[PDB]
Design a protein around this ligand. Structure first.
Ligand SMILES: O=C(O)Cc1cc(I)c(Oc2cc(I)c(O)c(I)c2)c(I)c1
Length: 258
């Protein structure tokens, strides 16, 4: 029924979507256009081997990773902006906020990375490039296996055929996780998330007539994520210990260590 309570939920869906569009330049809608040749906007350069990598650019493995950590950080900005737009979020203790975002960003990042991914590879540099999945593998060990798990996550996640409107609400649901280590006011965070979770369930029901237990099937991805993120850190521990010669951006090093 279209009661006042649902109306308010739909308002919450719309606010969140509008904020997401303002904070997130490359939306999934834009990405998929590019990826399907539907766009008439400039086609991206395709890094599929060493040659095309060098021509696109106008050690390798290390360069790519150091470029990704620069995006890894611009992303964390984007995210932070959006998180602040979530109703209730700023009216939380500033030390709960920093916590939710410390433990949350990476989940969001890999959620949204999936928007830029197909079977073949990933869009990069805000739509201007595309790096092939097989190429990111062919990177020398241990750098050959840091994305593979994200591509594995992405192909399953993308099967759900979530749109930007869905992902808006879902990303909020994650950020307001009521079980991050070192949370003072847990009751408020859970109270907002309850509200978001109602919003998301209703959004999904409306937007996905074909597919039941999607809401279910989505929340299960929250788990796949936390796993991916763990395994990513464990690799970063190995890399940091293998290649104690390169430099790891200090802001990531604050997040990763806890
Ligand atoms: O966690 C990790 O494995 C590291 C990582 C993080 C991001 I974020 C990536 O995705 C992008 C998206 C855009 I847009 C870019 O411009 C670039 I460079 C990388 C990739 I690949 C790898």
């Amino acid at each position: 029924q279209l009661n006042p309570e649902s109306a308010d939920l739909r308002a919450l869906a719309k606010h969140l979507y509008d904020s997401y569009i303002k904070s997130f330049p490359l939306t999934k809608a834009k990405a998929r256009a590019i990826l399907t040749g539907k766009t008439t906007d400039k086609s991206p350069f395709v890094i599929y081997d060493m040659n095309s990598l060098m021509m696109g650019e106008d050690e390798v493995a290390i360069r790519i990773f150091q470029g990704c950590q620069f995006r890894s950080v611009e992303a964390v900005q984007e995210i932070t902006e959006y998180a602040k737009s979530i109703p209730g979020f700023v009216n939380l203790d500033l030390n709960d906020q920093v916590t939710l975002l410390k433990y949350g960003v990476h989940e969001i990042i890999y959620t949204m990375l999936a928007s830029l991914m197909n079977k073949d590879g990933v869009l990069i540099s805000e739509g201007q490039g595309f790096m092939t999945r097989e190429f990111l593998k062919s990177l020398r060990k241990p750098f050959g296996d840091f994305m593979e798990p994200k591509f594995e996550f992405a192909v399953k996640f993308n099967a759900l055929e979530l749109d930007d409107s869905d992902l808006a609400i879902f990303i909020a649901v994650i950020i307001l996780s009521g079980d991050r280590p070192g949370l003072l006011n847990v009751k408020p965070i859970e109270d907002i998330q309850d509200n978001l979770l109602q919003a998301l369930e209703l959004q999904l029901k409306l937007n996905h007539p074909e597919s039941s237990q999607l809401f279910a099937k989505l929340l299960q991805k929250m788990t796949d994520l936390r796993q991916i993120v763990t395994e990513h850190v464990q690799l970063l521990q190995v890399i940091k210990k293998t290649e104690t010669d390169m430099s790891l951006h200090p802001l990531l090093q604050e997040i990763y260590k806890d």
